[PDB]
Structures are given as structure tokens and as C-alpha cells.
Design a protein around this ligand. Structure first.
Ligand SMILES: Nc1ncnc2c1ncn2[C@@H]1O[C@H](COP(=O)(O)OP(=O)(O)OP(O)(O)=S)[C@@H](O)[C@H]1O
Ligand SMILES: Nc1ncnc2c1ncn2[C@@H]1O[C@H](COP(=O)(O)OP(=O)(O)OP(O)(O)=S)[C@@H](O)[C@H]1O
Ligand SMILES: [Mg+2]
Ligand SMILES: [Mg+2]
Lengths: 338, 191, 10, 334, 56, 54
């Protein structure tokens, strides 16, 4: 019943700028409901979220779980291991899913699964490894039949046979080093001479733009096996957050960073005011860190460190103001007393 | 003295000669008079590059004042024989053989620098002996002159008659003049 | 059964 | 009477496309199985090995095969299998699954069919902890494939000398192994013959020349491959076949999306020109027919996102330009 | 610490230590502090063969 | 001795040997002495491009 526009609006409240990824998830979730409403067999298209650090992959999933009537779980690929080893088994994901559905098998098969840090199980090289990849390739192999569809045994609290042909899988990870792979395939003009195309570090293809030209052969060289990529046919890319986006992240979202510190200072008894000029400076410094939106927390804290250290001892403090200079370190935040 | 340059690789750093590092990037240098030894060396460089990647274009730089015709044919035949297009760039100057090996490059990949100078002329030779032997060698060089003009006409697209009139004496050409003549395709003035 | 822990070499 | 191989192939053709060689092999083996069942000299069973690239139709053939045959059919994944005594799974578990389909009828289960997918995932590595999921599983299967009594809880003894086994997997890297052995050359002179990448034989053309020694290098035990004498090879895919997968099969993508839009109140139409373009793109992805699903999704993403909001929309048309992204799909209102 | 499915202690073991100090009170352990010393020892040094997996 | 996660050994094994002499009395072992011989063998070769398990 819910339309993708409605779903994207819920995500837009918490996620800024990932229009393409919000469309894919909205459409997939809507199609999941459509496919769910009907009991010709309708196949499912699994998603693959590729984006840089601090782009909103895990955030999109968390925002999705809030509005998802069907069971949603969010697993991790690091803990997984090939069957027969001490590490957590791949089937545990299904067990985790049942916990959300009160151990209802019919309600679990209709679920959505998010797998984060999928890039951590990738093979080291394109060619098969000569040693057993317990936490890498082995996990990919075991996931194949899970995504496409098979029956899995789950210990209830005998085993419970849970099918996965209808379960949706959203495997997302920050593929680091994939941009280099794409550049080799897309540039093909490296060299030293005149005919060669020599460009500077600046004014060249960025990581965000390169991922937009991602194709399976690129992921193959990164380590993902061909069988695994076929299970995940829908590839959604998230671009690097621009300064304009970061400025919005600080105030527009409901659980924004500025609101977090305001709540902290408010329960303490102090008001916190961020001037518009300051938010533009924080974004500039953050981009330099190349850590995404998370970089904002590093700037803000360093700017209010001394303030937070001296404020509780201080008395009769009702408001704090942070102008652009405070970020640069050439000034001290202004304080207003009662 | 040739400087030794370092290349950074995942396996490690290997010190390469400045001329060898360029070879790794499909760059060949045709400098000095064209003789049999240098030609056999250039030939070997082409064959090695063809095997490494027969789909990437080769770049051959020409700063030669000309040389033996026989050795040049070895380079010309090898260029046409191999699959990759042999881009020919003219730096400084290209004489009769250098120009022949400049226009012999792939159509659309024959470059020349703006201040370069091209020169085409008829073959040179001679013989001392009996009248019979002189006639034989004379006919041979004449066939070479005709054969060279046929190939020059093929790459430049000009008529054999026009080439004979322009090749009868030393004729110099600048980079823009050459483009109109068809010896080269474009000029590399800036990046 | 008994879980096996792979020991990396070199 | 019992069905003939021609009839079996017709049933498979309804859901599978472009695997004439393998379809014959499976139909022949299945027909022979019924002949042995009726004749309950002792006839021997030929185990099958399905080798094909991703999205070629191996698992599909098995699923389609199960639908029409009466005898018990069980689908197993070699990944979950482990050496006896470990916590992953036991090989005999396969038989247990079989009995569920046979309702714990041994006489009806010994005459059954078994399929083992992802067989290439239990290969042998080059390390000296015990590879519980590799060589150990292969040795345990040898006993199962050759024929022996296995204890299964309802314990029950179930012979396996008569059970048929169809082990198939996408052997990746096997093509490289074959190329070394078969594609000699790589010289540097005039006489030598360069690779000429365009000319390079693709996996489909390269796997047809497979031999048992090739599988040895891939990591399979010799006794294992010997037990499986038959080797059915699948071509990667053909662009013509890709265009057929979208229209001819029952559960084709076009029919899926048409049903999707239909329950929503919209009739989706695909033009022949578009299907040719989608197939071309799919072949470039080198992920089989499954990659084809992505292209369709992308071309329809914007549409499916804005379709419910739209009203009085009775039909959607997809042109060739829509696949490339230059144009927008046309709509017809009511 | 080591990657999952290896001989070394698992990362989750840290939380176990926390529970021990918290008398296995999960509600009181989710509010705890953790100090991971020698964090520089888990860094890929540089330019190494990728055939092997840096499990440490 | 080798790095954690490798086939060779773990450094905690030393304490186990110490406990053997202490009859598995932790309080008695926590105040023990250990002699690590051949310490020069655990040495580099500056930083190292690859991991040195031993
Ligand atoms: N588009 C966004 N809108 C709002 N907040 C964002 C956005 N992108 C990042 N953030 C912030 O960054 C934090 C982390 O975002 P994540 O999406 O979890 O990062 P990530 O993509 O998971 O990177 P990984 O998973 O560690 S590789 C969130 O909790 C937000 O506070
Ligand atoms: N020949 C075919 N005819 C029709 N559909 C096909 C064909 N080949 C592949 N497909 C499609 O691909 C899906 C699965 O193909 P598979 O046979 O599972 O490929 P595969 O050989 O199993 O590769 P794996 O299992 O990942 S190693 C089917 O459900 C169809 O949607
Ligand atoms: Mg994350
Ligand atoms: Mg399969």
C-alpha cells in the first residue's frame, strides 16, 4: 500500500542527498509488498549498496527498519564463516530474523535482510586463492543459495526449515580500492609520452563519479565472485557528500549533530547556538578529512572541547554562541550570562 | 650518461634506465643515422611490444638525419607487419628515411611538433667498376627510387608523378606544410 | 561436533 | 507408459533455453532410470556432471526436472557439507532429505534422483587445519556415489548404489587451466602467433575441451571424477537465447514485470527492439541471464517510483532508447 | 584479536570481559567504557603481498 | 612463539607452563618468575613491509 514517494519521504527526513539509493530501496520495498500481496512466480531483485565512508548506507537501513512492517534484521559479514568453523554461521541470519517475527516462519520468509561490510569478505584477487578463505570467499559461497533461494535449518529456541526464495537481501559495503579498478578500465590512457593522457591529481575522475561507472567486471577484480554478483543484480551508488549536503546534515535531520550537542548542553542548563557561517566552515574542514559526514563530529568536538570542560564549573551561563572564527581557532566562543 | 629512474610497483621498486622505462610505456626512439644495428634493435623493440599487448598503439619518436635505406625498410616492414598502430612523432627533424618512417605510421596517428622540420629527397648511391656492374647497381637504385615513391604516395595520398617532381631535389617542409602534403596528420603544439 | 579454527601460516 | 526422452526435453524446453546438449544428457539418464526401475546382467548408472558458467541453466534444469518426474528428487548444496563429526553438516543428511520426499520409503528412495550444486566449492586447496569442507567431503561422497548402506534417523539403512547423482557447479578458473594445457604459443617473432585477444576462446568454447586431468588441477579427487563419467557442458549464453529468455519461458522477466504492473493497474508492453538491446547489455556484464534482470530494473526504476503517484495511467511502453537512457518510457492515459 | 574463524581471541571477547566486571548485567554493560591498547599493532604496514589475508 | 592467529604458538602459553609448576594455583603463579631464552631471535631484519610473525 505505501507508495515509494511516502517511503522516500521517511528516509529523506534522516538521509540527505542519496536520491538514487532512496529510489532503489523505495521501489524494492514497494515491490516487496506487491510481491507479498500476491501468493507466474514473481522473482526478487536483491540490492547492492556501494558507497564511500560516511555516505548513508547503514543509516538508510536503520531508517528503513523503523517503517518496515515486515521483519528487518541487519547482519554483518565479518562474523560469518564457512560451515564447520568456530565463527558464526550464515544461517544465523535467519535465526536472527525469527527473533523479530516472534518465531513465525511464514512471517520471516516475507522479510528483508541487510548485510553490512560485505566488502570485507571479498577475495584478495580476481584469481581463486590457493588457501581456504574461511572468512572471505567461503562466506560468499555459503550466501549464494541463501539469496537465490533454498531451505535453511534454524534451531527453535528438531529444526525449523525456513525458505529464502522470497526474502530480500540488501548487501552494502564501502568498497575501498574499487575506484582504482574502474580507473584502469575507464581511462586506458596512462603513459609518459605525448600520446599519453597525463592529468594532475586535481581535475581528474573522483571516487564518487568512478563508482557511478561500476560494472560487474570491476567488482570481479575487487574480489567478489561472479556467482555472488548475479544474486545481487541491482547496484545502487551513493555519492560523496558535498559541502552543501554536510551543511544540511548538521541542522535539517531530526537526529542531527547540532541537535545532539544542543540537547547535551540543554540538560546541563546551557543553550547552544550555531551561526550559519560556522556550519560552512565545519563542512570545509570535514571534506579534507575524507571520512564523510562523520568528520563533522571531529571538528565540532575539537571546537567545543575547552567549552565543555569549563562550563559545568561555570555558573550563571544561559547561552553559548559559536561564530566562524571559533572553528579556525582564532577566537573563543561568546558566553551570555543571566 | 643515461639516468636511472625508479618505478614504484606493488612487488617493489625496480631501477630502470630512462630509455627502458619509456619502452615499458610503448615508446621507441629513432635517433641518429639509420644503420643496420640500430634498426635491428628498434625491430626487436616492436616485436617485444607486439607480444606484450598487440592491441595498444606504439609510439616511435623520430629525430634522425636519415640513413641507409635497407635498414629503414626493415623498420617499415615491421611497422606494417605488426597489428598495433605505430604512431610516429617527429621531434627536431625527419630526413628522407625518417620522413618515410614518419608518414608510414598509422593514419590519424602521425604527429609532428610545430617547430620540427621534414625533408624528403631521392636516394643516394654510387659504384666504381666496369660499365656492366655500374648498370646493374644503377637499375637497382632506380627501382628503389620508384618503390619508395610508390609507398610515399600511398600514405600521403598524393600522385606518384607529383612525388617524383618534389623528390627530385632536396625539399624541406615545416610541420604545417607537411599536413597539407599528407606526410603527417596533426600537430602537437600543447597538451 | 567440533569447530575448527584455521591457523594462518607464513 | 513411461515417458520418452523427447517428451522430457519438451518439458525442459518450456523453462530452459539454449542447452540442447545437456538437455539430451539429462533426458537420456532420466529415461534410463525409469527403465532400471521397471527392471527391478545388472544395469549400471551413469552419474552426470554439469559444468557451465553463471546463469547458464544448471539449477534451473534440476528444478524443472523435479516438476515432471515421479521418483524422489532432492537438491543439496555442497557448501553446507562437512566431514563426519564436525558441526557443519553430514553427507548422509542428503538421504534424510530424500526420505522426506519418499515418505520414508526405502524401496522408493533408492530409485531416486539426487542433485548436488556448488560442487566446485568443495575442491582441494594447497595448505597442510584440516579442510573439513574440501577433500574430506569428497571422500565421504565417493562412498555415497559408489554405493553403500548409510544409517539415517527416521536408524534406517538406505542403499545408494542405484541412486543417481547429478553434481554440477560453475567451475571458475577451469578455463584458465584448460588454456594453459591447450592454448600454447606466446612467442615474440614474426613466425610466432600472438594472443590476439579478440580471437581468444571464451569459457564456453574452452570448457567443451575439458578432460578429467583438468578437474584434477582444479582441486577434485581423481576417484571422484571417475565415478562421474558423463560430463555435460553448457554454453555461456547466446544473445539470441537472451532475447528468448524474456518471451518464451513461462517465468520470464517480461511476464514477471507485466504481472507486477498488472496488479497495480497498468499494462506494460515491451518492444522487440528493446529486448535485443537488453540482451546486448546483459552479455557485456558476463554474469549470465541474471545480469539481465538488472538492466530491466534500471530502465524501469524511475517509472516504478513515479507510477503509483500517477493517476489515469493504463499502459506503459518501453522503446529501445529507454534502455540506453536517452529517452523516457511512453505512457498512455485513460 | 583476530578475524573470525581463526585461533586468536575473538573481538567479542572484549564485551565478555566487560560483563565480568558488570556481574553479567547487560543493561549495566551497554553503558560501559572500553580501552583498546596497542591499537597501532593492527595496522597493515604497507606494500605487502595481497595473496595472504591480514587476519591480525 | 608467534603472532596471534598463526600456527606456531601463542604468547600466553608461557603462563600455562608457569601454572603447571604452581599446581594451577593462580595466586601462587601471579607472583612467579619467567626466563625467556633466545630473545635475540625475535628481532627485525627499521619498519617491515610485511608482517613478521616470528
Ligand atoms: N546522508 C546522510 N544524512 C544524514 N546523516 C548522515 C548521512 N551520511 C552520513 N551521515 C551521518 O554519518 C553517520 C554514519 O553514516 P553511515 O551510513 O553509517 O556510514 P557508512 O556508510 O555505514 O560507512 P561504513 O558502513 O562504516 S563503511 C550517521 O550516523 C549520520 O550521523
Ligand atoms: N537457459 C536458461 N533459460 C532460462 N532461464 C535461464 C537460463 N539460464 C539461466 N536462466 C535464468 O537464471 C536463473 C538461474 O540460472 P542458474 O541455472 O541457477 O545459473 P547457474 O548455472 O545455477 O549459476 P550458479 O548457480 O550461480 S553457479 C533462472 O531462474 C533463470 O531466471
Ligand atoms: Mg556501516
Ligand atoms: Mg546453481
Amino acid at each position: 500500500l505505501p507508495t515509494p514517494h511516502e517511503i522516500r519521504n521517511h528516509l529523506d527526513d534522516y538521509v540527505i542527498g542519496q536520491e538514487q539509493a532512496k529510489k532503489v530501496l523505495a521501489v524494492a520495498v514497494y515491490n516487496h509488498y506487491k510481491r507479498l500481496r500476491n501468493g507466474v512466480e514473481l522473482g526478487k531483485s536483491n540490492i547492492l549498496l556501494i558507497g564511500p565512508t560516511g555516505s548513508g548506507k547503514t543509516l538508510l537501513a536503520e531508517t528503513l527498519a523503523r517503517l518496515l512492517d515486515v521483519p528487518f534484521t541487519m547482519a554483518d559479514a565479518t562474523t560469518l564463516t564457512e560451515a564447520g568453523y568456530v565463527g558464526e554461521d550464515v544461517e544465523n541470519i535467519i535465526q536472527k530474523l525469527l527473533q523479530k517475527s516472534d518465531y513465525d516462519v511464514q512471517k520471516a520468509q516475507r522479510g528483508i535482510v541487510y548485510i553490512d561490510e560485505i566488502d570485507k569478505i571479498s577475495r584478495k584477487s580476481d584469481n581463486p586463492s590457493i588457501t581456504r578463505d574461511v572468512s572471505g570467499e567461503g562466506v560468499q559461497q555459503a550466501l549464494l543459495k541463501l539469496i537465490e533461494g533454498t531451505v535453511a535449518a534454524v534451531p527453535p529456541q528438531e529444526f525449523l526449515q525456513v525458505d529464502t526464495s522470497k526474502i530480500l537481501f540488501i548487501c552494502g559495503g564501502a568498497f575501498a580500492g574499487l575506484d582504482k579498478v574502474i580507473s584502469h578500465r575507464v581511462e586506458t590512457g596512462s603513459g609518459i609520452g605525448f600520446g599519453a593522457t597525463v592529468k594532475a591529481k586535481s581535475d581528474k575522475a573522483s571516487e564518487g563519479e568512478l563508482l557511478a561507472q561500476v560494472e560487474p567486471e570491476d567488482l570481479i577484480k575487487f574480489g567478489l565472485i561472479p556467482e555472488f554478483i548475479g544474486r545481487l543484480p541491482v547496484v545502487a551508488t551513493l555519492n560523496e557528500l558535498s559541502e552543501e549536503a554536510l551543511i544540511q546534515i548538521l541542522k535539517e535531520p531530526k537526529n542531527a549533530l547540532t541537535k545532539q550537542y544542543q540537547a547535551l548542553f540543554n540538560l546541563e542548563g546551557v543553550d547552544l547556538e550555531f551561526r550559519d557561517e560556522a556550519l560552512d566552515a565545519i563542512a570545509k574542514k570535514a571534506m579534507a578529512r575524507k571520512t564523510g559526514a562523520r568528520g563533522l563530529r571531529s571538528i565540532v568536538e575539537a571546537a567545543l572541547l575547552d567549552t565543555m570542560y569549563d562550563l559545568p564549573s561555570m555558573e550563571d551561563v544561559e547561552k553559548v554562541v559559536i561564530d566562524e572564527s571559533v572553528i579556525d581557532g582564532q577566537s573563543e566562543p561568546l558566553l551570555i550570562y543571566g | 650518461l643515461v639516468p636511472m629512474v625508479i618505478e614504484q610497483t606493488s612487488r617493489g621498486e625496480r631501477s630502470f634506465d630512462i630509455y627502458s622505462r619509456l619502452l615499458k610505456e610503448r615508446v621507441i626512439f629513432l635517433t641518429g643515422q639509420v644503420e643496420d644495428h640500430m634498426a635491428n634493435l628498434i625491430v626487436a623493440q616492436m616485436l617485444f611490444l607486439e607480444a606484450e599487448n598487440p592491441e595498444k598503439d606504439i609510439y616511435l619518436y623520430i629525430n634522425s638525419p636519415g640513413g641507409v635505406i635497407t635498414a629503414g625498410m626493415s623498420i617499415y616492414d615491421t611497422m606494417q607487419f605488426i597489428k598495433p598502430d605505430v604512431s610516429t612523432i617527429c621531434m627536431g627533424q625527419a630526413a628522407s628515411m625518417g620522413a618515410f618512417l614518419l608518414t608510414a605510421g598509422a593514419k590519424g596517428k602521425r604527429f609532428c611538433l610545430p617547430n620540427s622540420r621534414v625533408m624528403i629527397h631521392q636516394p643516394l648511391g654510387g659504384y666504381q667498376g666496369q660499365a656492366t656492374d655500374i648498370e646493374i647497381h644503377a637499375r637497382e637504385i632506380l627501382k628503389v627510387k620508384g618503390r619508395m615513391n610508390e609507398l610515399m604516395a600511398l600514405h600521403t595520398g598524393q600522385s606518384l608523378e607529383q612525388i617524383e617532381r618534389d623528390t627530385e631535389r632536396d625539399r624541406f617542409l615545416s610541420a604545417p606544410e607537411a599536413v597539407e602534403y599528407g606526410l603527417v596528420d596533426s600537430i602537437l603544439t600543447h597538451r | 561436533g567440533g569447530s575448527e579454527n584455521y591457523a594462518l601460516a607464513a
